[PDB]
Design a protein around this ligand. Structure first.
Ligand SMILES: CS(=O)(=O)c1cc(Br)cc(NCc2cccc(CN3C[C@H](O)[C@@H](O)[C@H](O)[C@H]3CO)c2)c1
Ligand SMILES: *[C@@H]1O[C@H](CO)[C@@H](O)[C@H](O)[C@H]1NC(C)=O
Length: 765
């Protein structure tokens, strides 16, 4: 039955708009297959279209906003794009139709409406670009009856091992098509849908913009050669209309020009299924998907007071939809330094200069290929897998569709190498790389990232203990299936646990350090004078200078999160030998958090170094780091240390702003200094951890029940309202929030862990 659910999940999830790096495009969960993308831009001049054309996601003055109004990857959804530069409001509706043996069928409606500022007679170029990778696959444009292009539908017939036989149709659509009275119309026609069918080597098919522009340029060169000149030039929109040449190839460019509003459909029909998909099917299944999205949202994200209002529900639907709508399928080689240079051990003072010298040997090489199916922080800025971000992303997604979340977890752990390393940043293939400066592509097998994916696994375990509808929960509804998933993943979780303990070890034994355990102590590898990128809190202040005797309380707390998860999963699988070890490690971390990291003077947890005189020193910088044992759920609800942490959390002069918890205390010497990334702003991912732990204490007997209830109530309200007010004013989820003004700052379209807000509103943890 595990095998049966696996195949049905495969078939359900195969097709999607799984190219979140571009406004709109489709690909299946197959490395070398059929991909589509949408391009559009106004044309007012002989030179403007190169500057107006849209393809890859951006955010700037020219784009008001964009995102998914509703989305669920098994069914499809609706995207809204508000383009000021091109004066267009665009809708892309995408729907999946199950059937046959090859992942089913799908359809898209593209609709563009001029805004009130646009010229009513605006000419808009729209391109549908289709590519297919594979040695033994075929794709052919059926030629038109008409001389110069198509009056009706463009039909593509293709075949592959992976998709079987299929037909991809771009409909005639509705809208005025401009007609040229120019002499050129005798050879190029007066204006119509055109198709160019081309072949390039498989590895460059993703470069749609340059491929398109090379064809436009060859057309303009043809005009120059054949005496079309500035004495009497064709109109711009005819100069940029490709000569019709349909045929077979691994690239097909479908170009339409519209005057005023337009719409057209894309119908992908799987031959292995029944009747071919129609525009009538598309309209019906779009209406059905909305109805089903609506009913699941009310069940899963039942917003509690005081966020019951319709405004909050629309806000919640927008944040959730953009998070799950960012799901991508990536395929290609990663760039990895596999030298394991001894400088990467960082055992000496000044280790950052040694490691810089090693990096400057440039022994990094492409390896793979790998695939990844994952949500992303940001379409315009970070359209790729980040390891600790994905733990936050999957908390709401698992509520929606636990089988989807387990698919993404499996996809991530299938990247783990023999030693137990997953790269914190997955840049798979040339397309993924095109967005990342070379200096920043190379992954390092000594760089960790917080194991936040274990949190998702903890939610799954608690749910396990206590057709698209049925599939979404198969892995909890059928315990045999749930357990088999954990049996197969369990060794990889354990391998990662051992990797952390082996590669991120701190030094107790070699200094004057007293503690309950000689073993449990941790130091993030990879830190520079001003940074610790691997912790996730890039520029949160750490001991100066960095030093091989450093110990990091967040890293120890993360290892606690992992042991506790392995106790749970180990127990379920009857791995008795394993569970007794985990139990002794947990006990050791509990004691060593106090013996190495607790400051009585300051009343919080601290990172540690060793002095100029080789002695253990605490270095206290009050902020997220100070609370880590509490954020990760390691403290007993009666702990005196908890009470001191609750006082710190609640203190307005330290962490507590009207807009949420500050990353760093106003009292710290490093408040608002340097890049001020994690040195004052409010981050929703760490606020979400605080909110969940306060709620845990508020719904249990103990000395802090009422303190925790008050802080829970207020922090939930402060966080939700800051994210909502900013969404209402800007249309955006932001990366972080200003604790003086409450303004969203840094990166827009951060959905992204800012979307946890939908879990905070729905409550009941
Ligand atoms: C002056 S700056 O404000 O542009 C600035 C200051 C400092 Br210092 C460092 C950086 N790095 C750039 C950078 C690269 C890749 C992803 C991110 C986004 N975040 C950063 C999160 O910290 C990380 O936890 C999270 O996984 C990651 C993904 O969501 C950012 C930028
Ligand atoms: C889905 O089935 C195909 C069959 O060719 C298989 O090779 C592929 O790995 C499966 N997809 C996954 C594991 O998501």
């Amino acid at each position: 039955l595990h095998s049966e659910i696996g195949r049905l999940n495969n078939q359900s999830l195969l097709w999607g708009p799984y190219r979140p790096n571009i406004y709109f495009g489709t690909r299946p969960r197959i490395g070398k297959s059929l991909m589509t993308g949408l391009m559009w831009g106004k044309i007012e001049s002989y030179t403007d279209f190169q500057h107006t054309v849209r393809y890859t996601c951006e955010q700037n003055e020219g784009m008001k906003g964009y995102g998914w109004d509703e989305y669920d990857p098994r069914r499809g959804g609706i995207q809204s794009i508000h383009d000021i530069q091109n004066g267009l409001d665009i809708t892309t509706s995408f729907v999946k139709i199950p059937g046959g043996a090859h992942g089913g069928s799908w359809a898209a409606r593209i609709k563009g409406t001029l805004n009130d500022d646009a010229p009513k007679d605006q000419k808009t170029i729209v391109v549908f670009y289709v590519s297919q990778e594979g040695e033994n696959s075929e794709l052919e444009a059926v030629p038109s009856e008409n001389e110069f292009g198509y009056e009706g539908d463009v039909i593509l017939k293709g075949r592959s091992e992976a998709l079987g036989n299929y037909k991809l149709v771009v409909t005639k659509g509705k809208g005025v098509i401009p007609q040229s009275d120019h002499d050129l119309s005798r050879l190029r026609g007066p204006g119509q849908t055109v198709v160019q069918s081309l072949t390039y080597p498989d590895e460059v098919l993703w470069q749609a913009k340059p491929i398109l522009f090379q064809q436009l340029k060859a057309g303009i060169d043809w005009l120059v050669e054949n005496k079309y000149d500035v004495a009497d030039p064709p109109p711009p929109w005819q100069v940029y209309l490709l000569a019709n040449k349909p045929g077979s190839g691994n690239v097909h460019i479908v170009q339409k020009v519209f005057e005023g509003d337009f719409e057209f459909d894309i119908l992908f029909s799987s031959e292995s299924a029944g009747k071919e998909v129609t525009s009538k099917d598309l309209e019906r299944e779009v209406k059905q998907a909305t109805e089903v999205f609506g009913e699941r949202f009310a069940r899963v994200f039942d917003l509690k007071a005081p966020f019951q209002g319709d405004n909050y529900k629309k806000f919640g639907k927008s944040m959730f939809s953009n998070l799950i709508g960012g799901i991508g399928y990536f395929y290609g080689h990663s760039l990895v330094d596999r030298s394991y240079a001894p400088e990467y051990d960082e055992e000496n003072e000044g280790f950052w200069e040694d490691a810089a010298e090693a990096r400057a040997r440039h022994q990094e090489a492409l390896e793979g290929p790998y695939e990844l199916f994952t949500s992303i922080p940001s379409r315009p800025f970070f359209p790729r897998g980040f390891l600790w971000d994905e733990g936050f992303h999957l908390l709401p997604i698992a509520d929606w569709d636990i089988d989807l979340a387990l698919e993404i977890i499996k996809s991530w752990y299938n990247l783990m190498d023999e030693d137990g390393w997953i790269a914190r940043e997955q840049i798979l293939g040339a397309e993924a790389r095109s967005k990342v400066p070379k200096e920043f592509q190379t992954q390092y097998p000594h760089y960790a990232n917080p194991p936040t994916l274990f949190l998702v696994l903890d939610n799954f375990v608690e749910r396990l203990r206590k057709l698209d509808e049925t599939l979404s929960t198969a892995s909890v509804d059928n315990p045999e299936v749930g357990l088999e998933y954990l049996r197969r993943l369990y060794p990889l979780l354990r391998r990662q646990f051992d990797w952390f303990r082996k590669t991120q070890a701190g030094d107790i034994k070699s200094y004057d350090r007293e503690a309950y355990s000689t073993k449990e102590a941790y130091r993030w590898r990879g830190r520079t004078v001003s940074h610790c990128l691997t912790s996730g809190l890039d520029d949160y202040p750490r001991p100066q200078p960095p030093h091989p005797g450093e110990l990091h309380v967040d890293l120890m707390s993360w290892v606690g999160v992992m042991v506790k998860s392995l106790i749970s999963i180990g127990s379920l699988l009857g791995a008795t030998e394993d569970v007794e070890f985990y139990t002794k490690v947990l006990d050791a971390i509990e004691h060593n958090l106090d013996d190495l990291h607790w400051s009585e003077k300051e009343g919080c947890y601290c990172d540690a170094t060793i002095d100029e005189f080789e002695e253990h020193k605490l270095v206290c910088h009050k902020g997220y780091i100070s609370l880590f044992p509490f954020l990760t759920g390691l403290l007993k609800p009666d702990s005196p240390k908890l009470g001191k942490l609750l006082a710190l959390i609640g203190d307005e002069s330290e962490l507590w702003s009207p807009y949420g918890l500050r990353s760093l205390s106003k009292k710290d010497e490093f408040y608002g200094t340097a890049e001020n990334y994690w040195r004052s702003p409010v981050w929703i991912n760490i606020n979400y951890l605080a909110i969940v732990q306060l709620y845990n204490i508020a719904t249990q007997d103990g000395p802090y029940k009422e303190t925790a209830r008050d802080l829970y109530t207020r922090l939930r309200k402060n966080i939700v309202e800051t994210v909502y007010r900013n969404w209402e004013e800007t249309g955006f989820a932001w990366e972080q929030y200003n604790p003086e003004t409450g303004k969203g700052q840094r990166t827009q379209h951060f959905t992204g862990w800012t979307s946890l807000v939908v879990k905070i509103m729905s409550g009941h943890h």
